[PDB]
Design a protein around this ligand. Structure first.
Ligand SMILES: O[C@@H]1[C@@H](O)[C@H](O[C@@H]2CO[C@@H](O)[C@H](O)[C@H]2O)OC[C@H]1O
Ligand SMILES: O[C@@H]1[C@@H](O)[C@H](O)OC[C@H]1O
Ligand SMILES: [Zn+2]
Ligand SMILES: [Zn+2]
Length: 197
């Protein structure tokens, strides 16, 4: 990753702004999850027998920008590399899944259609989270998925094409809160080093 350039190791949930990028590090506290901020839009995460975690850099609020990201994602088990964010009013968690490893996180949903963007095809899903952690505390909220059929690490995400496809499928979005290039994991180990450009 950033080698000597990695910032102080973070092992418990926190947010901030580092080198002009918003960063969110959330963990339920299972296993060992270690996050570091690098120069510019870089972050690194290393995990071992984790619980649930979601971490990365981007913007707060998000403004539907075209994202470019680079780097490496090396899971050993259940992990997702995604454009990840929240809307408020209504409260929505959303995922533009670039790669998943051993578990399709769209599992438990009727497919609502497809969007073709950034040289790939994404399947669209909606689910519900009940009494779940959120940017508002314990809450019930809609989850929207765009899941790339040809997994990749890096490239361009035109977030507005996803938002448009979701609105077209009848999925309402609120006021944008954060939007990051996230590494997520559950009951797994791995490492990732991702640069948001
Ligand atoms: O302290 C609270 C954080 O724990 C909360 O973090 C969210 C929890 O739900 C996860 O799905 C999200 O990824 C994470 O951002 O945000 C609100 C804060 O007060
Ligand atoms: O509750 C939220 C969950 O659905 C998410 O994906 O992990 C972070 C928190
Ligand atoms: Zn895959
Ligand atoms: Zn491919």
């Amino acid at each position: 990753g950033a080698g000597a350039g990695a910032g102080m190791e973070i092992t418990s949930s926190e947010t901030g702004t580092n080198n002009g990028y918003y960063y969110s590090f959330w963990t339920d506290g299972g296993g060992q999850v270690t996050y570091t901020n690098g120069p510019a839009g870089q972050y690194s995460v290393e995990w071992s027998n984790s619980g649930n975690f979601v971490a990365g850099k981007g913007w707060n609020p998000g403004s539907s920008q075209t994202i470019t990201y680079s780097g490496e994602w090396n899971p050993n088990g259940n992990s997702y590399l995604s454009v990840y964010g929240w809307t408020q009013n209504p409260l929505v968690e959303y995922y533009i899944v670039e790669s998943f490893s051993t578990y399709d996180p769209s599992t438990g949903a009727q497919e609502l259609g497809t969007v073709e963007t950034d040289d790939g095809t994404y399947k669209i899903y909606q689910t519900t989270r009940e009494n779940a952690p959120s940017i508002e505390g314990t809450a019930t909220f809609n989850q929207y998925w765009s899941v790339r059929t040809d997994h990749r690490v890096g490239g361009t995400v035109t977030t507005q094409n996803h938002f448009d496809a979701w609105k077209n499928a009848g999925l309402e979005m609120g006021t944008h809160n954060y939007m990051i290039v996230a590494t997520a994991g559950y009951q797994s180990s791995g490492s990732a080093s991702i640069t948001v450009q």
